[PDB]
Design a protein around this nucleic acid. Structure first.
Ligand SMILES: Nc1ncnc2c1ncn2[C@@H]1O[C@H](COP(=O)(O)OP(=O)(O)NP(=O)(O)O)[C@@H](O)[C@H]1O
Ligand SMILES: Nc1ncnc2c1ncn2[C@@H]1O[C@H](COP(=O)(O)OP(=O)(O)NP(=O)(O)O)[C@@H](O)[C@H]1O
Ligand SMILES: Nc1ncnc2c1ncn2[C@@H]1O[C@H](COP(=O)(O)OP(=O)(O)NP(=O)(O)O)[C@@H](O)[C@H]1O
Ligand SMILES: Nc1ncnc2c1ncn2[C@@H]1O[C@H](COP(=O)(O)OP(=O)(O)NP(=O)(O)O)[C@@H](O)[C@H]1O
Ligand SMILES: Nc1ncnc2c1ncn2[C@@H]1O[C@H](COP(=O)(O)OP(=O)(O)NP(=O)(O)O)[C@@H](O)[C@H]1O
Ligand SMILES: [Mg+2]
Ligand SMILES: [Mg+2]
Ligand SMILES: [Mg+2]
Ligand SMILES: [Mg+2]
Ligand SMILES: [Mg+2]
Ligand SMILES: [Mg+2]
Ligand SMILES: [Mg+2]
Lengths: 260, 260, 260, 260, 260, 260, 260
DNA sequence: ATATATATATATATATATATAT
DNA sequence: ATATATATATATATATATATAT
């Protein structure tokens, strides 16, 4: 049972992907853009479910490689490091395509990146956290989208919009957008119960996320999916660590106070 | 028919060159400058039809090569990468002339570029996106225009003007200019219908630039050719994907909202 | 006896760790977060007992190394220098893990830090004085917590909260918190006597921290564990230097006036 | 006649040297400096007639070579490329003297340059666009002037003055100067008519550059010669291309608007 | 004749300089100050003929440049922009002397301004609208007058006097003054007729500005030269637009009512 | 004689140093302070004779340099520019000592300034117009006076006193002071005649500055030496320009009215 | 005797250290803090005897170096320059310890400073004029005191208190303080006579600082030691320069008036 | 003969922050 | 509250001769 307890904390520790309306709308939108080689920017709030949705979109299309040829990777997802220069972006791109870099000058990296990017038949390049990369590499992402006909989707906090706003063409080129929903309302109530069954995975305790727990969670999370996830996992881990089989109102008040 | 559908999305995906007053004025202007070996700068807004017009001008004069001699390329078009140094500009120039570079020092590249640039009888050097190249290569483009009697036409967003403004001679040498029109008015109404027949190549809805669709498009595109094209292709692709044979007002409202 | 006097001033000079409710609550909280790989921020006042408590938590879990393998360091504690850049943070992290740095570029440091951070099985990364590091390294600490599943605990004065407030995701990601108590009241009275026996270590003088000395110390320290420790050590050192065997009211009034 | 038209556009395309007070003052000044082996710097505005005047001075003294000995080149004119290093300056100098370079180290180039520079009896070294060469080659031009007794005349935009100002001896050594005139006033009126007869070379049209055309040209050129020339050649080419035998007010308004 | 009508409205549109006692007194005064390198302030009312008089004084002494040396500009006239800082004043000064600015720090601008201000042998620096520049640049104008021995003449509305009054030395240094006359009386009657012949330039209509028109104009203009000019030009333009060959009493009553 | 007239206006244009009780008291005071390395501040009114007196004190002690060693400059006089930062003050100091600055950081300038300031054996540092320099450079002037034992004499309008008043130590350190006299009374009467013989230098006209001219000048100048000088030079120049051999009462009334 | 006179002015010129109750209290206080590695801030007025007292404390403990090892410098005194950055503070610290700096980055300086600061066994770091250093170096002084167990004593005018007040921990960490006495009263009377014998060193004149001279000095100095010293030295120098063997009431009235 | 590190500093902003001002 | 210098520590690519030891 302590073996089972180790299973429980490890399983609750790792995150899951519970499919809700947000990620489905995002996938539909991204399919629409990718069929049209259209570069959009999918902006949203922070702690709201953007990176997970882009990852899910990256996975449903896992590259199916020909028996002996370079794998046709339709969607490429990279999330650059802080102040990603043009060299670093190319390193990340050609790394995700699983071509190790040969040491060279920025131009050599650019040339090799274009070569493996046309070779692997990339259709969409999702740059997550695209407010990090420097203004002098938006020129190269513009170049990629400009010549290879690749739908570049810049993901990022609202800060990304101002980041593209002070530049001129990036703002013109990346103008189709899709704001992440806040999720508040009856749909938020569904999500709450959806987390109980899908992710929490506990023997049914007849909790049912009643208006009390819902008031607590609307009070605490403010609608952010992260916050829903962080709070519920913490409460579950706490309750199982103290022997409680289900989640009490006590531990819910605990995590509520220790956030706000 | 699904075969036909694949034909339709692929054809709508790729862009066309619909000839309108803007590109014709530009060609006439560039012919005037080229007959006089006059270096101008053709500035304009962003998402407005500059690169396409320069490309069209590059194509009508496709080089006619002597049977065995280097091809006389009258117009050379290059659009340098971000922070194009003097070496990189020469690489791009001598690449467009189809002479592969022999590895060497910046001086060697300069000498070879002058040699193949006088050899191919180049008359005009259109540097698109000429706000990218560094201030220390305007000296070399000045040198080219200075010694080879070649009309250098710098294309770029308005940022290019400030870019040449802080330098001194580039501003004096490149002072003849041609602003890209915004196109708004009755001429915009013509363009709208001109896109229906030329580029959309779909069964006519008999809209004839109907004032409703025109209000929508004036409302949405703000006159940018780049926005009429993006919107119309998206609406066409959407309507054909959902089975609709023509474009409904519904999908037009869709793309309108998803831009602004 | 002068030998004994040297022992006394040296022992009073060095600090001790007297276990009280604050550090116990902190350890319990940090255990809860670490079992859940949950990143919190344990904020509090200044001169209040945060660094000492984090150090005590670092020590109870001293790494138990396999006979010949890299030591599994469960908790890593670093307190960066002023304006810690991303390179400097990685240097400190990989230093605490006892891997000397090989000279390289910021990317190389990042890669090596991730490699030794997954190797040593780190579970928690306590960044003390986490208001120092620059905004452009919160991205990397976000990245660490993001990919390695490591509970990053940012410690700091209240200034840290504003420091994370102007940034966007750091504020969302680090939202569970634990304010340091001020300690005032009967519990403060206990602490006072607890310092007499544990840390002061003097032959019993029947002082007993009577309401007079308590009024003085509540008057002087304002509850900060730092002010009590500083005051009591000074008074003890003074009294032993002037030959007094216990602490008089005179020296207590002395240190009281010389603070406020 | 179309043959004649080709003659006309080709003749108008190429530039001429119309002798006016500016170049005459410059030649007199340079003769004075050269008789005294005096290094000056002839600064001026941009688009004003400096390079042409230095070239004219270079040509009136074309080297008269002894029957079989190295030609005594009294005046040497070079205009270095961007960031001319010490090696590059020597290459240009010994190239202008028509001694091909033998591949070697910077020292070897220096030694050979001194040898051919004393051999050809050079008296004056006009470095046009002398704001290009790097600060570490002003030492070598100082050396040349210091040992060979050669009047080094640095030509350049006003930026050259600041370029020598941050260095110390170059500023002391090159302190005699001659600012290029702006030419505005009655003398500008003469120049205008002087361009009609000398350079435009058209059947007399009784235009006579009347106060109207003079207001236009003062309005447009702002006195810059190289602007009077650009405008007049363009207007002439346009008028001859559209069949007009003389220059109309229409085409003058055209070029006026298309500059400012 | 419509051609003639276009000539008439264009000629009436542009202003002239009719020489009257005010500008002559000002020139005599400024000559007296300039021979003595004496800094005065020529204060006056608003809409009264100060800027025009200073301009006329600037023009009679148009700089006569040596054949090849910097032009000796005896009088320099600048009218700074709103809240002219010390950098901006130097930019305007060295611009009027036709030396383009090299980008630098405020100190660099100051040094270059002193260098070109002693070089061009400037004798008088007329700062028109000298109530605009900030209090922290009166120090620099004091410095100029202080070291170069240059007669600085501050022009401005009466607000300028209070502007110098709250500062201390500017008030002491700029104390010689010359108030602009209001012009009312018989001399105003002369001016009225002087505007008919000099500036209005119409076939003689035997109007002669009789006591009626004089009562109207004394009633309307209140003596301000600007209002006379404004009124007379408007009446002339109106009368010529409605076909009237001379100015009727009707249009004079019109402009009179539409001012007051 | 017109040659003589040019001599007269040029001689009257340039200023002289007529020695009167004010400058003698100042020199005695400054000698007393300098023998004692005492930092004072010699405050006074504006337009009163402070800068001239400090200059005269600077000149009587012209540095006597050893045959080959750095010149021992006992008194150093600088009058900083507006908002003189710490770098700028050091530039001015080490400039007056005739050591050109080597480009560096503020610290490097400080170190070099201390080195050449101890080398040239400076005894007194007269900062004229010492209300200009910023509050953050009073620290460095405090430092100079603090370490080198150099009598720093801050000169300035009364505004300087408030400028040092809001700072704390500058006010304590610079507290010995010497107010400039207003000069009104019989001593003013002497000065008046002293200007006739010393500075005006005219054939004796038996004017003798009688009670009438004295009433005029007391009425006009209010005792300021500047105004005494400004008025007398203007009247002399006017009278000599209009042919008058001496100064009439007419021109005295003229300058009187044109000041007040 | 003139030789003797040169001895007298030179001896009076240089300052002495007359030991009075203020410096003795300060030394006792600093010994108490240093035995306890306690960081205090010894605040006081300006022109009151703080720097001299800290210097005297620095000298009584002159480092006694082992025969061949780094000298154990117990007390380190530095008084940073204006806006001392973190690099500059480290330069000053490691300079006072007589280790010349090896050129490097701010981090390298920090590391070397910690290394030589633990090596020389520093016990106390007296930062005189500690209101100069920037807020971003209080972090490093906090760090020093934080890790090396070094009693950092910040000296400064009252402005230092506000300087630490707007920061947060510096105010908490440096809270023990010692205000400089104003010295007024009978103790001031003693000091007065103590300056006669100790510092003035004159043949006894039976002056005895009688109530008259005491009223003058209380009237003039206001108790500041700095002013007693300044006044007495000036009066002594004056009286010896004018031949007077003792100090008269005349010269005392002189310096009194020339201060206030 | 040749590739070879091998430093070579070396620019150029590069923002980036921080006043200080109205 | 919005704007404008201004010093400054720093990271970065880069390309240039350059000796030099097989
Ligand atoms: N569809 C989902 N299913 C399950 N968990 C999710 C889902 N979306 C988000 N989360 C949780 O939310 C957190 C990650 O959300 P994330 O997608 O990173 O938001 P984010 O906005 O992309 N982060 P950031 O963009 O940097 O502010 C994790 O705790 C996930 O468990
Ligand atoms: N004449 C044209 N015919 C058809 N499509 C055109 C035409 N001109 C522009 N476009 C469309 O506009 C987009 C390209 O316009 P483009 O010429 O690049 O503007 P641009 O200003 O040069 N881009 P940029 O300069 O970087 O802001 C594409 O979507 C084209 O389909
Ligand atoms: N004396 C002249 N006769 C005829 N054309 C002239 C003359 N001087 C200048 N030009 C024209 O002016 C242009 C060249 O002027 P130029 O001498 O290069 O000015 P510049 O200042 O040297 N150029 P730059 O120094 O780089 O700003 C050409 O168009 C010439 O035709
Ligand atoms: N001497 C003149 N001859 C002709 N028109 C004049 C003359 N003086 C002034 N004006 C007219 O008056 C107007 C300009 O007067 P102006 O000299 O600017 O007065 P001002 O006081 O300098 N303006 P301002 O100082 O800003 O109040 C124009 O309409 C001129 O036509
Ligand atoms: N001793 C003197 N002999 C002759 N002229 C003098 C003398 N003192 C002052 N002046 C005149 O007064 C003017 C300069 O006086 P100045 O010494 O600058 O006063 P100031 O107070 O220092 N100026 P400022 O401090 O900025 O208000 C000049 O016109 C001098 O000719
Ligand atoms: Mg995210
Ligand atoms: Mg484009
Ligand atoms: Mg702490
Ligand atoms: Mg030129
Ligand atoms: Mg005006
Ligand atoms: Mg003065
Ligand atoms: Mg002090």
């Amino acid at each position: 049972d302590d073996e089972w307890l180790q299973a429980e904390i490890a399983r609750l520790k790792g995150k899951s992907i519970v499919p809700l309306q947000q990620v489905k709308t995002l996938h539909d939108w991204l399919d629409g853009k990718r069929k049209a080689r259209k570069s959009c920017r999918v902006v949203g709030e922070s702690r709201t479910g953007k990176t997970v949705a882009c990852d899910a979109y990256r996975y449903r299309h896992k590259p199916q490689q020909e028996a002996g040829r370079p794998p046709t990777v339709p969607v490429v997802y990279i999330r650059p490091h802080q102040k990603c220069g043009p060299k670093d972006l190319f390193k990340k791109i050609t790394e995700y395509l699983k071509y190790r870099v040969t040491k060279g000058t920025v131009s050599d990296f650019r040339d090799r990146t274009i070569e493996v990017l046309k070779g692997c038949g990339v259709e969409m390049l999702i740059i997550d956290e695209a407010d990090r990369l420097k203004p002098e590499t938006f020129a190269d992402v513009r170049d990629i989208a400009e010549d290879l006909g690749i739908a570049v989707v810049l993901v990022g906090t609202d800060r990304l919009d101002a980041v593209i706003k002070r530049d001129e063409q990036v703002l013109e080129r990346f103008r189709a957008h899709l704001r992440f929903g806040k999720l508040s309302g009856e749909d938020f109530k569904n999500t709450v119960e959806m987390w109980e069954q899908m992710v929490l995975k506990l023997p049914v305790s007849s909790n049912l996320k009643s208006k009390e727990m819902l008031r607590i969670l609307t009070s605490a999370t403010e609608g952010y999916i992260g916050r829903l996830d962080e709070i519920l996992r913490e409460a579950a881990i706490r309750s199982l660590s103290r022997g409680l089989k289900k989640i009490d109102k006590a531990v819910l008040q605990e995590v509520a106070k220790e956030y706000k």
